[PDB]
């Protein structure tokens, strides 16, 4: 034929990356799939190809134990975790903690929460202004997961605002000092709340887990109790919020797919799968450590290195998804790493899908003329190597439905 070559170098975790990371991710899969990142907190490797990410998630040589950084002999002297969360642990501890809490997020248990969710969603849709510009993140995307997780756990939703500040400090790329403060406040708050729970119990998870703790220290230590609370609280809001944000923006930017869902509202399940694929809310999985030398797409990652798996990146891999940049809500897809894979698979996957489906299906039913109240390039993203997430979303809700 006849051709010319275009080069284009994209910012990785600075500048434009926060605005739109996908072109950066797309260059990575094709030319640099296993990439050492000189972050100012030392090297952290990034895997961007689907196959590779998938295999890594079940590769037993890839531990959640930070002591793999330190030489063999120093592993005894040090704690297994910064905080005894199951997401930061390998089996057998992980197994024990996940088994405790498993039943409480069972598929069908979450399914019967759906009417409650739908109520909460409608409650805000009944209460939002018809003409003004509203922030959809803080007034809608935030609320639904926060409120739901709080009612589930037994947290006074009076404190929504309080802990969510500390929560977004831990999730965003904050100074190491800033995060310590937040964890201390979270830990401190949750310790106090659990104490107040010894005096007066409810039906919710914390009450239940508290009893298991007190009655069988080997099943759940006090520290594991608090840390388990920190995790469900945090994974409570800071993930679904961005499924709802990203999922909404996707429809606003793709009038054709918006159209499809308006004519067949039952496409909502299929759509939520596509949103999670198309703009994955958890962009990179939390850090994994090499327990020993590994090799992916022909690149060795030494023993004792940190490793992020590129979730947002991998779900746009052509090798897995035909035409991966097309937003197609009609897809009947399987696999997809947005929720993880293997023994650490998202505990709230079903809950999250329900929140997504209701939050978005209801919003687009109740408000046909919903529109961005700003330019696409005016929207601001949180700087986080863990969530792809909007800070705010100015929109006009427009009139309601007849
Ligand atoms: C759309 C929103 C959500 C996304 C994108 C998401 C993503 C994930 C991913 C990718 C993992 C595995 C991390 C890894 O292997 O490194 C995960 C684990 C987990 N998630 Fe979800 N999640 C979402 C909603 C939730 C909700 C609503 C809960 C409710 C409690 C939740 C609780 C958990 C817990 C406890 C773990 C650790 C599981 C374990 O290690 O056994 N997440 N989340
Ligand atoms: C991990 C390491 C590895 C060890 C580093 O020294 C510090 C570090 C921070 C990460 C954290 C700490 C707090 C809890 C966090 C923020 C997790 C968070 C509570 C989970 C929410 C996302 C998940 C649901 C996918 C994800 C990353 C976790």
Curated annotation (Swiss-Prot):
Pfam families in the record: p450
Keyword vocabulary terms for this entry: Cytoplasm, Heme, Iron, Metal-binding, Monooxygenase, Oxidoreductase
KW Membrane (keyword) present: no
Binding site residues for heme: 346
EC numbers: 1.14.15.15
Cofactor: heme
Impact upon substituting residue 383 to R: Increases 25-hydroxylase activity 2.8-fold. Increases 25-hydroxylase activity 21.6-fold
Compartment annotation: Cytoplasm
Reactions accelerated catalytically: 5beta-cholestane-3alpha,7alpha,12alpha-triol + 6 reduced [adrenodoxin] + 3 O2 + 5 H(+) = (25R)-3alpha,7alpha,12alpha-trihydroxy-5beta-cholestan-26-oate + 6 oxidized [adrenodoxin] + 4 H2O
Source species, domain of life: Bacteria
Broad enzyme group: oxidoreductase
One Gene Ontology molecular-function label: cholestanetetraol 26-dehydrogenase activity
Family: Belongs to the cytochrome P450 family.
Name of the protein in question: Vitamin D(3) 25-hydroxylase
Organism: Pseudonocardia autotrophica
Protein encoded by which gene: vdh
């Amino acid at each position: 034929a006849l051709t010319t070559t275009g080069t284009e170098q994209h910012d990785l975790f600075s500048g434009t990356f926060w605005q739109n990371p996908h072109p950066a991710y797309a260059a990575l899969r094709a030319e640099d799939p296993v990439r050492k990142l000189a972050l100012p907190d030392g090297p952290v490797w990034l895997l961007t190809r689907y196959a590779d990410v998938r295999e890594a998630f079940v590769d037993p040589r890839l531990s959640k134990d930070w002591r793999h950084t330190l030489p063999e002999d120093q592993r005894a002297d040090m704690p297994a975790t910064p905080t005894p969360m199951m997401i930061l642990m390998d089996p057998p501890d992980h197994t024990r903690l996940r088994k405790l809490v498993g039943r409480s997020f069972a598929v069908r248990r979450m399914n019967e929460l759906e009417p409650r969710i739908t109520e909460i969603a409608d409650g805000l849709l009944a209460g939002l202004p018809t003409d003004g510009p509203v922030d959809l993140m803080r007034e809608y995307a935030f609320q639904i997961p926060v409120q739901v997780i709080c009612e589930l756990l037994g947290v006074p939703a009076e404190d929504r605002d309080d802990f969510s500040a500390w929560s977004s400090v831990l999730v965003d790329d904050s100074p190491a000092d800033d995060k310590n403060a937040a964890m201390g406040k979270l830990h401190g708050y949750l310790s106090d709340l659990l104490e107040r729970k010894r005096t007066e119990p409810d039906d919710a998870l914390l009450s239940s887990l508290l009893a298991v703790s007190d009655e069988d220290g080997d099943r759940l230590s006090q520290e594991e109790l608090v840390a388990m609370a920190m995790l469900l609280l945090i994974a409570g809001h800071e993930t679904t919020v961005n499924l709802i944000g990203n999922g909404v923006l996707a429809l606003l930017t793709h009038p054709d797919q918006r159209k499809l869902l308006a004519e067949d509202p039952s496409l909502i399940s299929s759509a939520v799968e596509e949103f999670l694929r198309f703009d994955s809310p958890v962009s990179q999985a939390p850090i994994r450590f090499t327990a020993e030398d590994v090799t992916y797409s022909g690149v060795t990652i030494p023993a004792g290195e940190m490793v992020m798996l590129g979730l947002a990146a991998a779900n746009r891999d052509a090798d897995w998804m035909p035409e991966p940049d097309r937003l197609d809500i009609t897809r009947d897809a399987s696999g997809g790493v947005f929720f993880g894979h293997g023994i650490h698979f998202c505990l709230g996957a079903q809950l999250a899908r329900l929140e997504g489906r209701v939050a978005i299906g209801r919003l687009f039913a109740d408000r046909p003329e919903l529109a961005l109240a700003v330019g696409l390039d005016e929207l601001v993203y949180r700087e986080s190597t863990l969530v792809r997430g909007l800070s705010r979303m100015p929109v006009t809700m427009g009139p309601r439905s007849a």
